[PDB]
Every structure is written in C-alpha cells, then in structure tokens.
Amino acid sequence: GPLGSHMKGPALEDFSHLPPEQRRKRLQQRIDELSRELQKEMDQKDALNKMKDVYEKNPQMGDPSSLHPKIAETTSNIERLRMEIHKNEAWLSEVEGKVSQRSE
C-alpha cells in the first residue's frame, strides 16, 4: 500500500496515534529539535560558502570543488530539517484547531 506509512525509521510522519493534546506537546518538542538542528546546518552552509570563498581567494586551503559535496549535503539537510518543521506545523494547524477531545 502506497499509503502504508512508509516512514524512514525515527522519522515519523504520523504522531496521530497519540491524542491531540499529547501530540502537540511532542510536536513542539520535535520542532525544538529540528529548529535547533537546522540552526547548525544553516550556519554550516554559510561556513562552507565562506570556506569555499577562502579556497577560491587562497588555494592555500585546497580545492573548492572538493567542498561542493559539503555544501550540497549541508543544504540538503537544511531542506530536510526545515520540511520536518513544516510537517509538524501542518499537524499543529489541525491539532490547535481541535484541542478539545470532542463532546464529554
């Protein structure tokens, strides 16, 4: 089944198996991790872009093309982490719209 929740290990695209209130609490914690993780990668990219420039202005360091895989993967992790923030926010859009567990 294409909709059989084919998730990549710890990368859950669900969090629905727990109730909205408990859910959003974990979503906030997930966003916490991902945003803090992303902060590293975003900085890492700028560092790599800076580093690349150093390799360009001063080949003393080495070859800038050897840093192309660096920037590529670094940016890929940036996208990866950011979209994982988005998925959480997407669920929050639902969860925070229905914080009540229906009627009593």
Tab-separated table of N, CA and C in Angstrom:
chain	number	residue	atom	x	y	z
A	1	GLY	N	0.830	-1.227	0.000
A	1	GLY	CA	0.000	0.000	0.000
A	1	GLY	C	0.848	1.254	0.000
A	2	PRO	N	0.637	2.166	-0.967
A	2	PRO	CA	1.409	3.412	-1.064
A	2	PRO	C	1.182	4.325	0.136
A	3	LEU	N	0.027	4.176	0.773
A	3	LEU	CA	-0.314	4.973	1.950
A	3	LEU	C	-0.072	4.176	3.230
A	4	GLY	N	0.809	3.184	3.145
A	4	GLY	CA	1.077	2.324	4.285
A	4	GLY	C	2.100	2.908	5.243
A	5	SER	N	2.156	4.239	5.306
A	5	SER	CA	3.072	4.966	6.190
A	5	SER	C	4.499	4.418	6.109
A	6	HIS	N	5.095	4.517	4.929
A	6	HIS	CA	6.467	4.064	4.725
A	6	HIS	C	7.442	5.100	5.267
A	7	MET	N	7.679	5.041	6.568
A	7	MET	CA	8.494	6.033	7.247
A	7	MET	C	9.935	5.563	7.375
A	8	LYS	N	10.857	6.514	7.398
A	8	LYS	CA	12.278	6.207	7.491
A	8	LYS	C	12.734	6.132	8.944
A	9	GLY	N	12.377	5.034	9.604
A	9	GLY	CA	12.833	4.785	10.958
A	9	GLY	C	12.263	5.767	11.963
A	10	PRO	N	13.125	6.536	12.651
A	10	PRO	CA	12.697	7.514	13.659
A	10	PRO	C	11.921	8.679	13.052
A	11	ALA	N	12.056	8.857	11.743
A	11	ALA	CA	11.360	9.926	11.044
A	11	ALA	C	9.883	9.590	10.892
A	12	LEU	N	9.109	9.901	11.919
A	12	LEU	CA	7.685	9.623	11.910
A	12	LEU	C	6.922	10.715	11.176
A	13	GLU	N	6.062	10.304	10.262
A	13	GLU	CA	5.174	11.226	9.579
A	13	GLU	C	3.748	10.961	10.049
A	14	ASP	N	3.598	10.827	11.357
A	14	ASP	CA	2.323	10.442	11.939
A	14	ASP	C	2.022	11.261	13.188
A	15	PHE	N	2.453	10.758	14.346
A	15	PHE	CA	2.158	11.373	15.642
A	15	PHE	C	0.650	11.418	15.912
A	16	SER	N	-0.127	10.756	15.066
A	16	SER	CA	-1.576	10.788	15.177
A	16	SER	C	-2.069	9.684	16.102
A	17	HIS	N	-1.204	8.708	16.366
A	17	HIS	CA	-1.564	7.583	17.228
A	17	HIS	C	-1.607	7.997	18.698
A	18	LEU	N	-1.259	9.245	18.965
A	18	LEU	CA	-1.419	9.822	20.290
A	18	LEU	C	-2.362	11.018	20.206
A	19	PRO	N	-3.140	11.260	21.275
A	19	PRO	CA	-4.199	12.276	21.281
A	19	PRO	C	-3.664	13.691	21.077
A	20	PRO	N	-4.459	14.558	20.417
A	20	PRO	CA	-4.074	15.932	20.056
A	20	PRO	C	-3.234	16.656	21.112
A	21	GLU	N	-3.688	16.630	22.359
A	21	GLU	CA	-3.019	17.354	23.437
A	21	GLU	C	-1.611	16.807	23.686
A	22	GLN	N	-1.492	15.487	23.751
A	22	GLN	CA	-0.194	14.838	23.901
A	22	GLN	C	0.622	15.014	22.619
A	23	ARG	N	-0.087	15.018	21.498
A	23	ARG	CA	0.512	15.153	20.177
A	23	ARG	C	1.253	16.478	20.038
A	24	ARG	N	0.535	17.587	20.218
A	24	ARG	CA	1.124	18.916	20.054
A	24	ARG	C	2.300	19.113	21.002
A	25	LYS	N	2.241	18.453	22.151
A	25	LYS	CA	3.299	18.549	23.141
A	25	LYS	C	4.584	17.922	22.604
A	26	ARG	N	4.441	16.838	21.853
A	26	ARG	CA	5.589	16.180	21.243
A	26	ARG	C	6.008	16.902	19.967
A	27	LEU	N	5.037	17.467	19.263
A	27	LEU	CA	5.312	18.242	18.056
A	27	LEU	C	6.171	19.461	18.379
A	28	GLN	N	5.839	20.149	19.468
A	28	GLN	CA	6.624	21.297	19.913
A	28	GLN	C	8.056	20.878	20.234
A	29	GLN	N	8.192	19.712	20.858
A	29	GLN	CA	9.498	19.162	21.195
A	29	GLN	C	10.260	18.750	19.936
A	30	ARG	N	9.538	18.240	18.944
A	30	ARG	CA	10.142	17.870	17.668
A	30	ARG	C	10.626	19.107	16.925
A	31	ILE	N	9.776	20.128	16.865
A	31	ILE	CA	10.152	21.403	16.264
A	31	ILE	C	11.368	21.978	16.980
A	32	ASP	N	11.403	21.794	18.294
A	32	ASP	CA	12.538	22.212	19.110
A	32	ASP	C	13.833	21.590	18.593
A	33	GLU	N	13.833	20.265	18.465
A	33	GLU	CA	14.997	19.538	17.968
A	33	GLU	C	15.369	20.002	16.571
A	34	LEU	N	14.387	19.981	15.686
A	34	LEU	CA	14.602	20.265	14.276
A	34	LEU	C	15.077	21.695	14.046
A	35	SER	N	14.523	22.648	14.783
A	35	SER	CA	14.919	24.044	14.636
A	35	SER	C	16.338	24.255	15.151
A	36	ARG	N	16.665	23.591	16.249
A	36	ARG	CA	17.990	23.695	16.837
A	36	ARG	C	19.007	22.960	15.970
A	37	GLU	N	18.578	21.843	15.400
A	37	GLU	CA	19.407	21.068	14.490
A	37	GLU	C	19.647	21.862	13.209
A	38	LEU	N	18.574	22.452	12.697
A	38	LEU	CA	18.624	23.242	11.476
A	38	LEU	C	19.536	24.454	11.651
A	39	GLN	N	19.486	25.071	12.826
A	39	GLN	CA	20.340	26.218	13.127
A	39	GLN	C	21.810	25.873	12.890
A	40	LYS	N	22.178	24.635	13.199
A	40	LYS	CA	23.539	24.165	12.981
A	40	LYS	C	23.838	24.092	11.488
A	41	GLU	N	22.921	23.485	10.741
A	41	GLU	CA	23.109	23.264	9.310
A	41	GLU	C	23.098	24.578	8.532
A	42	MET	N	22.195	25.487	8.893
A	42	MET	CA	22.141	26.794	8.239
A	42	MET	C	23.456	27.537	8.427
A	43	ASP	N	24.000	27.463	9.637
A	43	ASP	CA	25.295	28.069	9.932
A	43	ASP	C	26.403	27.345	9.180
A	44	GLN	N	26.307	26.022	9.151
A	44	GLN	CA	27.295	25.188	8.482
A	44	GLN	C	27.389	25.539	7.002
A	45	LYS	N	26.247	25.814	6.384
A	45	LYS	CA	26.215	26.184	4.976
A	45	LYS	C	26.959	27.491	4.742
A	46	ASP	N	26.684	28.490	5.571
A	46	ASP	CA	27.336	29.788	5.432
A	46	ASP	C	28.833	29.645	5.667
A	47	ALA	N	29.183	28.780	6.613
A	47	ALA	CA	30.574	28.469	6.899
A	47	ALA	C	31.238	27.815	5.696
A	48	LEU	N	30.506	26.927	5.035
A	48	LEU	CA	31.012	26.239	3.855
A	48	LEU	C	31.121	27.195	2.673
A	49	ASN	N	30.137	28.074	2.527
A	49	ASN	CA	30.174	29.100	1.487
A	49	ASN	C	31.355	30.037	1.710
A	50	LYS	N	31.582	30.397	2.971
A	50	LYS	CA	32.736	31.205	3.345
A	50	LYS	C	34.024	30.439	3.071
A	51	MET	N	34.042	29.180	3.493
A	51	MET	CA	35.197	28.310	3.308
A	51	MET	C	35.529	28.160	1.826
A	52	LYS	N	34.504	27.951	1.009
A	52	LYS	CA	34.677	27.837	-0.435
A	52	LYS	C	35.355	29.083	-0.995
A	53	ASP	N	34.891	30.247	-0.552
A	53	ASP	CA	35.464	31.522	-0.977
A	53	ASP	C	36.940	31.609	-0.603
A	54	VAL	N	37.282	31.084	0.569
A	54	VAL	CA	38.668	31.050	1.013
A	54	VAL	C	39.504	30.186	0.074
A	55	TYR	N	38.952	29.045	-0.322
A	55	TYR	CA	39.632	28.140	-1.249
A	55	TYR	C	39.779	28.783	-2.628
A	56	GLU	N	38.907	29.740	-2.924
A	56	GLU	CA	38.949	30.450	-4.194
A	56	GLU	C	39.964	31.586	-4.154
A	57	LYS	N	39.889	32.409	-3.115
A	57	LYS	CA	40.813	33.525	-2.960
A	57	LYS	C	42.207	33.030	-2.606
A	58	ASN	N	42.266	31.972	-1.814
A	58	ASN	CA	43.537	31.406	-1.393
A	58	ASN	C	43.511	29.883	-1.485
A	59	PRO	N	43.946	29.330	-2.632
A	59	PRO	CA	44.101	27.877	-2.829
A	59	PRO	C	44.995	27.205	-1.775
A	60	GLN	N	45.557	28.009	-0.870
A	60	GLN	CA	46.354	27.516	0.254
A	60	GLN	C	45.614	26.425	1.025
A	61	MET	N	44.293	26.537	1.069
A	61	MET	CA	43.467	25.590	1.800
A	61	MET	C	43.280	24.308	0.998
A	62	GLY	N	43.026	24.457	-0.293
A	62	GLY	CA	42.820	23.308	-1.146
A	62	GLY	C	41.952	23.630	-2.341
A	63	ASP	N	41.169	22.655	-2.773
A	63	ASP	CA	40.307	22.805	-3.941
A	63	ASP	C	38.850	23.020	-3.525
A	64	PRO	N	38.208	24.088	-4.040
A	64	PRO	CA	36.824	24.440	-3.689
A	64	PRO	C	35.795	23.435	-4.199
A	65	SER	N	36.113	22.741	-5.285
A	65	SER	CA	35.195	21.761	-5.851
A	65	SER	C	35.045	20.569	-4.910
A	66	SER	N	36.071	20.331	-4.102
A	66	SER	CA	36.031	19.274	-3.103
A	66	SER	C	35.060	19.643	-1.977
A	67	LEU	N	34.654	20.908	-1.937
A	67	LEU	CA	33.703	21.374	-0.937
A	67	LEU	C	32.294	21.427	-1.513
A	68	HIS	N	32.163	21.092	-2.790
A	68	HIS	CA	30.855	21.079	-3.438
A	68	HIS	C	29.929	20.024	-2.817
A	69	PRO	N	30.410	18.777	-2.577
A	69	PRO	CA	29.623	17.771	-1.850
A	69	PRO	C	29.241	18.252	-0.451
A	70	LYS	N	30.151	18.997	0.181
A	70	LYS	CA	29.912	19.555	1.511
A	70	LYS	C	28.667	20.430	1.503
A	71	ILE	N	28.679	21.452	0.653
A	71	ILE	CA	27.583	22.410	0.589
A	71	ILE	C	26.290	21.728	0.151
A	72	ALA	N	26.400	20.817	-0.811
A	72	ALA	CA	25.244	20.096	-1.329
A	72	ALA	C	24.498	19.368	-0.214
A	73	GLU	N	25.201	18.489	0.495
A	73	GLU	CA	24.592	17.712	1.570
A	73	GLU	C	24.123	18.615	2.703
A	74	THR	N	24.930	19.609	3.034
A	74	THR	CA	24.596	20.552	4.089
A	74	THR	C	23.269	21.253	3.791
A	75	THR	N	23.092	21.671	2.545
A	75	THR	CA	21.855	22.317	2.130
A	75	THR	C	20.705	21.308	2.091
A	76	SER	N	21.027	20.064	1.754
A	76	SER	CA	20.031	19.005	1.703
A	76	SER	C	19.494	18.711	3.101
A	77	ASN	N	20.374	18.765	4.096
A	77	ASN	CA	19.958	18.601	5.484
A	77	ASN	C	19.138	19.802	5.931
A	78	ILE	N	19.510	20.982	5.443
A	78	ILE	CA	18.750	22.198	5.705
A	78	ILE	C	17.308	22.039	5.234
A	79	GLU	N	17.142	21.619	3.984
A	79	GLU	CA	15.816	21.379	3.428
A	79	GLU	C	15.093	20.302	4.227
A	80	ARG	N	15.800	19.203	4.470
A	80	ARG	CA	15.263	18.059	5.202
A	80	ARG	C	14.704	18.483	6.559
A	81	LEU	N	15.501	19.210	7.324
A	81	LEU	CA	15.099	19.620	8.662
A	81	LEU	C	13.965	20.641	8.617
A	82	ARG	N	14.030	21.573	7.670
A	82	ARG	CA	13.008	22.612	7.553
A	82	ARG	C	11.647	22.023	7.194
A	83	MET	N	11.626	21.061	6.279
A	83	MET	CA	10.367	20.453	5.862
A	83	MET	C	9.786	19.591	6.980
A	84	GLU	N	10.652	19.083	7.848
A	84	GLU	CA	10.199	18.323	9.003
A	84	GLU	C	9.593	19.259	10.040
A	85	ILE	N	10.031	20.508	10.041
A	85	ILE	CA	9.393	21.521	10.862
A	85	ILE	C	8.007	21.817	10.300
A	86	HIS	N	7.941	21.927	8.975
A	86	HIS	CA	6.693	22.218	8.278
A	86	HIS	C	5.640	21.140	8.536
A	87	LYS	N	6.045	19.869	8.500
A	87	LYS	CA	5.104	18.771	8.731
A	87	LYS	C	4.486	18.890	10.121
A	88	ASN	N	5.307	19.267	11.096
A	88	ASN	CA	4.840	19.442	12.469
A	88	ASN	C	3.860	20.605	12.554
A	89	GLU	N	4.217	21.726	11.930
A	89	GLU	CA	3.345	22.896	11.894
A	89	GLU	C	2.028	22.569	11.198
A	90	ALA	N	2.103	21.726	10.175
A	90	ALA	CA	0.923	21.304	9.436
A	90	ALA	C	-0.039	20.546	10.342
A	91	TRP	N	0.506	19.672	11.177
A	91	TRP	CA	-0.308	18.926	12.123
A	91	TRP	C	-0.844	19.853	13.206
A	92	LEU	N	-0.009	20.789	13.650
A	92	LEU	CA	-0.417	21.773	14.650
A	92	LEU	C	-1.605	22.589	14.157
A	93	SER	N	-1.616	22.871	12.857
A	93	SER	CA	-2.719	23.582	12.224
A	93	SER	C	-4.042	22.861	12.492
A	94	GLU	N	-3.984	21.538	12.550
A	94	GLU	CA	-5.155	20.733	12.856
A	94	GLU	C	-5.347	20.615	14.363
A	95	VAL	N	-4.281	20.230	15.060
A	95	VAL	CA	-4.342	19.962	16.496
A	95	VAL	C	-4.838	21.163	17.289
A	96	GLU	N	-4.262	22.321	17.023
A	96	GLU	CA	-4.600	23.521	17.777
A	96	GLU	C	-5.963	24.060	17.360
A	97	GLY	N	-6.497	23.518	16.275
A	97	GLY	CA	-7.832	23.873	15.848
A	97	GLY	C	-8.874	23.009	16.526
A	98	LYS	N	-8.418	21.915	17.125
A	98	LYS	CA	-9.302	20.981	17.807
A	98	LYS	C	-8.647	20.436	19.077
A	99	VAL	N	-8.412	21.318	20.037
A	99	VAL	CA	-7.751	20.931	21.281
A	99	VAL	C	-8.703	20.173	22.204
A	100	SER	N	-9.992	20.239	21.904
A	100	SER	CA	-10.995	19.530	22.681
A	100	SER	C	-11.189	18.124	22.125
A	101	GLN	N	-11.298	17.144	23.013
A	101	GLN	CA	-11.482	15.757	22.605
A	101	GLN	C	-12.958	15.464	22.363
A	102	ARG	N	-13.572	16.250	21.477
A	102	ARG	CA	-14.988	16.102	21.148
A	102	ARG	C	-15.867	16.341	22.375
A	103	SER	N	-17.096	15.842	22.332
A	103	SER	CA	-18.034	16.027	23.425
A	103	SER	C	-17.608	15.222	24.650
A	104	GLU	N	-18.247	15.491	25.775
A	104	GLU	CA	-17.937	14.802	27.013
A	104	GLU	C	-19.058	13.828	27.360
